[PDB]
Amino acid sequence: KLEKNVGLLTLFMILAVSIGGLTQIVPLFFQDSVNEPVEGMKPYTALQLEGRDLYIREGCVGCHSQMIRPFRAETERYGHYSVAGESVYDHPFLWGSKRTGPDLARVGGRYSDDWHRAHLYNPRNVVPESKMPSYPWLVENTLDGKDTAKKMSALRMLGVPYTEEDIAGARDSVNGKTEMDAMVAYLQVLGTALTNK
Amino acid sequence: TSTAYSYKVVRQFAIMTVVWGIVGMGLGVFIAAQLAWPFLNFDLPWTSFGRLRPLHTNAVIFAFGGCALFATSYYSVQRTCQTTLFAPKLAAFTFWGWQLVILLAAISLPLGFTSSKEYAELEWPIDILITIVWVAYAVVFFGTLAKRKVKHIYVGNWFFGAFILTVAILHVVNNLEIPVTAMKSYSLYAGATDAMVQWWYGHNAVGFFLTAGFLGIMYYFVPKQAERPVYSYRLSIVHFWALITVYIWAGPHHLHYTALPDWAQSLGMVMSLILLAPSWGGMINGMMTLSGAWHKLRSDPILRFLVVSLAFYGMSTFEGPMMAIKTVNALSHYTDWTIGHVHAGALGWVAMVSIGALYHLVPKVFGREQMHSIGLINTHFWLATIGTVLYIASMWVNGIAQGLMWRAINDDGTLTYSFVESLEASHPGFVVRMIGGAIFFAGMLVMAYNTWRTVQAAKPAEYDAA
Amino acid sequence: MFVDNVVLAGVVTVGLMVAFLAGFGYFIW
Amino acid sequence: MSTFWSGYIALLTLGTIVALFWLIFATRKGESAGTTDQTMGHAFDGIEEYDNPLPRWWFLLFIGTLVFGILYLVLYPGLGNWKGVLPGYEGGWTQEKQWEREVAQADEKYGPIFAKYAAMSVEEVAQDPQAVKMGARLFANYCSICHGSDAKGSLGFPNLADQDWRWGGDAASIKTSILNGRIAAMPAWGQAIGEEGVKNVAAFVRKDLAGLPLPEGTDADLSAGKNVYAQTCAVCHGQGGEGMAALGAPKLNSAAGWIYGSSLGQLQQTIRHGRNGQMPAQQQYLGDDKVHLLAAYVYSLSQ
Numbered sequence A: 001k002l003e004k005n006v007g008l009l010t011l012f013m014i015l016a017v018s019i020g021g022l023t024q025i026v027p028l029f030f031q032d033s034v035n036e037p038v039e040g041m042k043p044y045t046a047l048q049l050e051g052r053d054l055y056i057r058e059g060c061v062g063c064h065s066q067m068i069r070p071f072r073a074e075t076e077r078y079g080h081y082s083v084a085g086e087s088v089y090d091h092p093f094l095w096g097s098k099r100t101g102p103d104l105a106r107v108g109g110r111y112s113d114d115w116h117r118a119h120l121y122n123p124r125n126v127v128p129e130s131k132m133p134s135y136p137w138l139v140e141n142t143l144d145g146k147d148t149a150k151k152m153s154a155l156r157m158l159g160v161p162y163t164e165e166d167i168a169g170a171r172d173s174v175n176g177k178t179e180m181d182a183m184v185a186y187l188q189v190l191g192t193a194l195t196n197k
Numbered sequence B: 001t002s003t004a005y006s007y008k009v010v011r012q013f014a015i016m017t018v019v020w021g022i023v024g025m026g027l028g029v030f031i032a033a034q035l036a037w038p039f040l041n042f043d044l045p046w047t048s049f050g051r052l053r054p055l056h057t058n059a060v061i062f063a064f065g066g067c068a069l070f071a072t073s074y075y076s077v078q079r080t081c082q083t084t085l086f087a088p089k090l091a092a093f094t095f096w097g098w099q100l101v102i103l104l105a106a107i108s109l110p111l112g113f114t115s116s117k118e119y120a121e122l123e124w125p126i127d128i129l130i131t132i133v134w135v136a137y138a139v140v141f142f143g144t145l146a147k148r149k150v151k152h153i154y155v156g157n158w159f160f161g162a163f164i165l166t167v168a169i170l171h172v173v174n175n176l177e178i179p180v181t182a183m184k185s186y187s188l189y190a191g192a193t194d195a196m197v198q199w200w201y202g203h204n205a206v207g208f209f210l211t212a213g214f215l216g217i218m219y220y221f222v223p224k225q226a227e228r229p230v231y232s233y234r235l236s237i238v239h240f241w242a243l244i245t246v247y248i249w250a251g252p253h254h255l256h257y258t259a260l261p262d263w264a265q266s267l268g269m270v271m272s273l274i275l276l277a278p279s280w281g282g283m284i285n286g287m288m289t290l291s292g293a294w295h296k297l298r299s300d301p302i303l304r305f306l307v308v309s310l311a312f313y314g315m316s317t318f319e320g321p322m323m324a325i326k327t328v329n330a331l332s333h334y335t336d337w338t339i340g341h342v343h344a345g346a347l348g349w350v351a352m353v354s355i356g357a358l359y360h361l362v363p364k365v366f367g368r369e370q371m372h373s374i375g376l377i378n379t380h381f382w383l384a385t386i387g388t389v390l391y392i393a394s395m396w397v398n399g400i401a402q403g404l405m406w407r408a409i410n411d412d413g414t415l416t417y418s419f420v421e422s423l424e425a426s427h428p429g430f431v432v433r434m435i436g437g438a439i440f441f442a443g444m445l446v447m448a449y450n451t452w453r454t455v456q457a458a459k460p461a462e463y464d465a466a
Numbered sequence C: 001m002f003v004d005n006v007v008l009a010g011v012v013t014v015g016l017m018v019a020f021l022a023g024f025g026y027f028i029w
Numbered sequence D: 001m002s003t004f005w006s007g008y009i010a011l012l013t014l015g016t017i018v019a020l021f022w023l024i025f026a027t028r029k030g031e032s033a034g035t036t037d038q039t040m041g042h043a044f045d046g047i048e049e050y051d052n053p054l055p056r057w058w059f060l061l062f063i064g065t066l067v068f069g070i071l072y073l074v075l076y077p078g079l080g081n082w083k084g085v086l087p088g089y090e091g092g093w094t095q096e097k098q099w100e101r102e103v104a105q106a107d108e109k110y111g112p113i114f115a116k117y118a119a120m121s122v123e124e125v126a127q128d129p130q131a132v133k134m135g136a137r138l139f140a141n142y143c144s145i146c147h148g149s150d151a152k153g154s155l156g157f158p159n160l161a162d163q164d165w166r167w168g169g170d171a172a173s174i175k176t177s178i179l180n181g182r183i184a185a186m187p188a189w190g191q192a193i194g195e196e197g198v199k200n201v202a203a204f205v206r207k208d209l210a211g212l213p214l215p216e217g218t219d220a221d222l223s224a225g226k227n228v229y230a231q232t233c234a235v236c237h238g239q240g241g242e243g244m245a246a247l248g249a250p251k252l253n254s255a256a257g258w259i260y261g262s263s264l265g266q267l268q269q270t271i272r273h274g275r276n277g278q279m280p281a282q283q284q285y286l287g288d289d290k291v292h293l294l295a296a297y298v299y300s301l302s303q
């Protein structure tokens, strides 16, 4: 019966519920294709890394995917379909689940820094029918680069091959730059790794 | 002595369930309005959509749904096995603890501290707090089971119990993260692996937090309100174990045609499709229970809530498997359709069933024979139903429109529509959804008023003893 | 409108949801 | 995937399916096969449970789903490293493989149209309406966001519909602009020229070159402005402000084609701190064919 047995029910629950996790997550740890970086690719630069964390804090993922599906129309619209190797150093991954705005997996060098600045400052100003929020504070805020060193150390600990050269003076790579500078820096590297390898 | 049920914690969690319901769904309406009229972002970092969205998410799932789950489980388990809650103070801890969690979310998320992982957005210290509170909750519940009176354990508690354990595992695994500073951590995982851990967690979140746990709710309140016996106990077994095991696999249906390997994607689709059966075993067991007593539906609006709740549950546990088919997801993914599915389940199943459950239990727990006004339970029912349907409809329209327009190719192979054209196409949808959600929210206000009126009546309210 | 395999799959899925809901809905009357 | 992992995945997936079948049947043994209405004797609170049979249809559905799942797995990748046996994809089926077919099929279908156009001169392509419409379709997807949906631009971004061209408006120039991109360089004169110097050339360019009136009471030395212009500006913009397409220096004898505004103040800012407009290269994103059609389209716009 095992209806009357609290520990037996508990045990078979924890057992039954585990199989899918063990069978789907675990083998991925050891699969090469999803752990191999694109050959050309480097880790995010201090400024790019800082800007990615800005992208994270602002909730960008919430309207913007970074994952191009292997369909002809998505290929035509955005570029080469995303590859596992592109997101190998992404702690945490920022594939989307919604596209309120377009996919950003390859905003690459599709736009000028100047455009990105104007548009982030006021999307409606450049794209009148945008539903994107204005992000002007990015201009008013300055990175001090205090924690960049720590961040990169942590990511290296997590596998990202940051050099000692990278961590040393990751601060002065960032200090004095504006948050907008960092966001733009991040956006301009997206998907570039693949198309110049 | 002490052979009087501990109704204190249930009382607190009930009231707070209505409160966070209001706050969360309010947030929902607001960000919907932001999607319609971006000026409502107010050029402020803490009120912009990107930051408020996960607040809506967490408030509505973990605060609203969460508190619903606490109140319901603490009431239900106690009666369904006939003893006072194990370690009642520890239950009180789980209350104030959970409240502290929600408040920490409310402060931290608009402040910008987010993991960026969906339904796991709170940073590591809050994840530690959550883990602690949850462990305590587990101890209270499974303890209450362990000191029951009857030999058998009601299936409602199979679902509750399961939900508790697997949510704990889920939460701990998916929030493994190196702390960098006070409110900033990096995920243990990256890329495809992180995606898979994320949606194993993500789906099994609605799978056990919003499905299993609420199936527990259904299994107590549907038979208790209808005063009919539960149909098909065998089904309870099958549908429970099959659901509990198959649902975990459903992770990859989120990551269809992504960088996630094909094999995993497929495993997810196949098992998502298998999942159709158990899921429906739930609504069958719920509805066929009402057979004969359907005349009560015109009589009792609480029962209305529970039943219609099951309707939407089945509908979304059908829609889900369908959208878990790669070719369908090929269109659905990234579109408002996902959101439509979401709120079909969210408003129509979770919200409805927890509403009904509260309308049932709140009088009881407040030493009172019934709600203040049954009429307002009916008007609530209609507001909430109309709202849900409007929401669903607008999101199907928008979603199909989007998928279609995005992939629309001309006779010469070129893309038919700019993304901005699709965006513009979606605005009517955004507004209709804003109104539907608004209406549902209004219903929640009606509930708040009603509940309040009944809450007024007795300061000593310890009725029920058995 | 533009019609593809995928668009058709989506449309009949939504239609099936309308059918399931309609059937259930009138089934409750 | 190492074989060990492939095996591990398959064995667990199959074991779970087998287990599922075992479960449905084992649950099914003493089946009334009828609504029955019996109840079991233990009460939870109010609630009691009928010992009822699984609905035959629900049973059927469940089984059918598992069968479909086995069929899918056999047809498609999923268990381990097992490759799909599905017909028509050699060596099995993968999303990437599927993608290659859709593109290849598309290339076979549409390739001639592109090919047909490629032989034709850019000026020839503009003549064909069919081509223009195709080009426009391309324009909206890739070019609209900067240059406007009407191709008439905005502040910072050229109006491609008008008759004013910064880098030249011949086919070859336009195509070059799109293909290789363009970066302009107005240097900054603030420090070099002095603030008063800035005010003066600004006034001169606005009034004397561009034929725009000056704001009431703005005593700028227009003579100074003129001299400054001749000394420095005329080198790139030409004297009299014809402008030089070679440098992408726009004409200054008409505000019509100006992308940074025409107000005295805006002119002052342009002059004081310079400008560096960028037209991103499309050679990489769109390729020669698309770019060719787009050059045709933009060319067509102005006639």
Ligand code: HEC
Pocket (backbone or CB within 6 Å): A055, A058, A059, A060, A061, A062, A063, A064, A100, A101, A102, A103, A104, A107, A116, A120, A123, A124, A127, A129, A130, A131, A132, A133, A135, A183, A187, B049, B050, B420, B423, D145
């Ligand atoms: C949802 C409420 C929005 C949030 C939050 C963000 N974006 Fe967005 N973005 C949105 C829309 C509706 C559009 C299309 C119209 C437009 O403004 O272009 C966009 C577009 C972008 C683009 C241009 C992408 C392209 O055309 O290829 C970029 C580079 C982009 N968005 C950046 C961005 C960042 C850094 C933001 C997070 C703070 C972000 N967006 C948030 C709607 C939404």
Ligand code: HEC
Pocket (backbone or CB within 6 Å): A110, A111, A112, A115, D142, D143, D144, D146, D147, D156, D157, D158, D160, D164, D165, D166, D167, D168, D169, D173, D174, D175, D177, D178, D182, D183, D184, D248, D276, D277, D278, D279, D280, D282, D294, D295, D298
């Ligand atoms: C925004 C991020 C850019 C995109 C995308 C496109 N264009 Fe553009 N273009 C842009 C600027 C800022 C300028 C001015 C450059 C300068 O001198 O400051 C331009 C210019 C052109 C020109 C030349 C116009 C002239 O007067 O000679 C052409 C022919 C051109 N642009 C057309 C074009 C097309 C077909 C592209 C879409 C893929 C397109 N542009 C995109 C801004 C940007």
Ligand code: HEC
Pocket (backbone or CB within 6 Å): D166, D184, D185, D186, D187, D189, D201, D202, D205, D228, D229, D232, D233, D234, D235, D236, D237, D247, D248, D249, D250, D252, D257, D258, D259, D260, D261, D267, D270, D271, D275, D276, D277, D278
């Ligand atoms: C040398 C080449 C330089 C010099 C010495 C000057 N200019 Fe001019 N200018 C130049 C380019 C390549 C461009 C295009 C800039 C861009 O599109 O990003 C310009 C543009 C201007 C404008 C703006 C026209 C518009 O609004 O679109 C003005 C007002 C301007 N330039 C005037 C100007 C004057 C007064 C200066 C002489 C000291 C002058 N320029 C010098 C190229 C160059």
Ligand code: HEM
Pocket (backbone or CB within 6 Å): A097, B118, B202, B206, B210, B211, B250, B253, B254, B255, B272, B273, B275, B276, B279, B313, B316, B317, B318, B319, B320, B321, B322, B323, B324, B325, B329, B332, B333, B334, B338, B341, B342, B344, B345, B346, B349, B350
């Ligand atoms: C058998 C049951 C179910 C299955 C197989 C299923 C499947 C799916 C699928 C295929 C998606 C689309 C994912 C994407 O394309 O991005 C999705 C999204 C979602 N569904 Fe369900 N669904 C089921 C039941 C439910 C129920 C009852 C709810 C009630 C709340 C629910 C809540 C959600 C949520 C919150 C998302 C969004 C996840 C995200 O943000 O990407 N699901 N589900």
Ligand code: HEM
Pocket (backbone or CB within 6 Å): A062, A097, A098, A100, B024, B025, B028, B029, B030, B031, B032, B033, B035, B053, B056, B057, B060, B061, B065, B118, B336, B338, B339, B342, B343, B346, B347, B350, B351, B433, B434, B436, B437, B438, B440, B441
């Ligand atoms: C009552 C009125 C509600 C309104 C108006 C509303 C509105 C919204 C809006 C506008 C979004 C973002 C849509 C987008 O990005 O396209 C959203 C997301 C979401 N809402 Fe609500 N909501 C409401 C209630 C609820 C409830 C009760 C739940 C209960 C679980 C819920 C769960 C969610 C979830 C899980 C998401 C994320 C979907 C995803 O990530 O794909 N909502 N809601």
Ligand SMILES: [Ca+2]
Pocket (backbone or CB within 6 Å): A097, A098, B118, B338
């Ligand atoms: Ca989502």
Ligand SMILES: [Ca+2]
Pocket (backbone or CB within 6 Å): B115, B120, B121, B122, B123, B124, B127, B175
């Ligand atoms: Ca978390």
Ligand SMILES: [Cu+2]
Pocket (backbone or CB within 6 Å): B202, B203, B204, B250, B251, B253, B254
């Ligand atoms: Cu899911």
